[PDB]
Design a protein around this ligand. Structure first.
Ligand SMILES: Nc1n[nH]c2cc(-c3c[nH]c([C@H](Cc4ccccc4)NC(=O)/C=C/c4cc(Cl)ccc4-n4cnnn4)n3)ccc12
Ligand SMILES: *[C@@H]1O[C@H](CO)[C@@H](O)[C@H](O)[C@H]1NC(C)=O
Length: 236
């Protein structure tokens, strides 16, 4: 996260860090708890992944350094990638992880509600992007979970900034016109969480952008509301 600030323990209890264990254990992507056995994340996270056997899902994490041998985690049974997915820049950047066991909801690990299909056209004004991603393009994964409040940009304006792309209504953009606050490398798959009528909704999934936090180049997120039927069908 560029231009963000440190989160506090328990501030984003749906946030997970998805780790790969081969050849060594490392953070790969962010993700969101959406159900007792389900993580919502980006399809592009699995580009170098042939099987879910190398994945570990960690909930309740503040610092990456707090993850030790005895820290509990969840195994992944199945990776469900949207069948129309090809590359982040072309959309359908969404994946479900079915956990090997169910999550016991606590203060440290809770689900985030999906947006309501009736709220399809709401332009949310209290949106936050979170993750352990880079603070600038040439950096490293942050130890402490970062957060940044970012405004949503309309599809029409976002399409004007990304003229060499097709920005569909299945994408949602967020960023300041002057730049300065954005997701960056290591944040993908994580949530764009918006508080609407005192309820947090998973409005976006961190997907891609032209550089990080550049002026007139907002971050591009998978527009979760457009995938509610797909999520309900895949999770039964
Ligand atoms: N352990 C690790 N060390 N270093 C690491 C680096 C990464 C990494 C590098 N790159 C990424 C992913 C893409 C990816 C590719 C292959 C496998 C998994 C993930 N992208 C993102 O995270 C975010 C992109 C982004 C999003 C928005 Cl809304 C706006 C602007 C953005 N950017 C523009 N230019 N950069 N970002 N992840 C992960 C783990 C580690
Ligand atoms: C988290 O890590 C930072 C260093 O990156 C350290 O200063 C801080 O004490 C750690 N916090 C907790 C809660 O362990």
């Amino acid at each position: 996260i560029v231009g963000g600030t440190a989160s506090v323990r328990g501030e984003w209890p749906w946030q997970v860090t998805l780790h790969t264990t081969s050849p060594t254990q490392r953070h790969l992507c962010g993700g969101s708890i959406i159900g007792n056995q389900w993580i919502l994340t980006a399809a592009h996270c699995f580009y170098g992944v042939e099987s879910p056997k190398i994945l570990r899902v960690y909930s309740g994490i503040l610092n990456q350094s707090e993850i030790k041998e005895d820290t509990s985690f969840f195994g992944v049974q199945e990776i469900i990638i949207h069948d129309q997915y090809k590359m982040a820049e072309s959309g359908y950047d969404i994946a479900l992880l079915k956990l090997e066991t169910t999550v016991n909801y606590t203060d440290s690990q809770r689900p985030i509600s999906l947006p309501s299909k009736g709220d399809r056209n709401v332009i949310y004004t209290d949106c936050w992007v979170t993750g352990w991603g880079y603070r600038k393009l040439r950096d490293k994964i942050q130890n402490t979970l970062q957060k940044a409040k970012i405004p949503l940009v309309t599809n029409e304006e976002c399409q004007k900034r990304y003229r060499g792309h097709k920005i569909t209504h299945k994408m949602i953009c967020a960023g300041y016109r002057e730049g300065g606050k954005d997701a960056c490398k290591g944040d993908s798959g994580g949530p764009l969480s918006c508080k609407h009528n005192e309820v947090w909704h998973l409005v976006g999934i961190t997907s891609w952008g032209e550089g990080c936090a550049q002026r007139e180049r907002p971050g591009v997120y998978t527009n979760v509301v457009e995938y509610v039927d797909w999520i309900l069908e895949k999770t039964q």
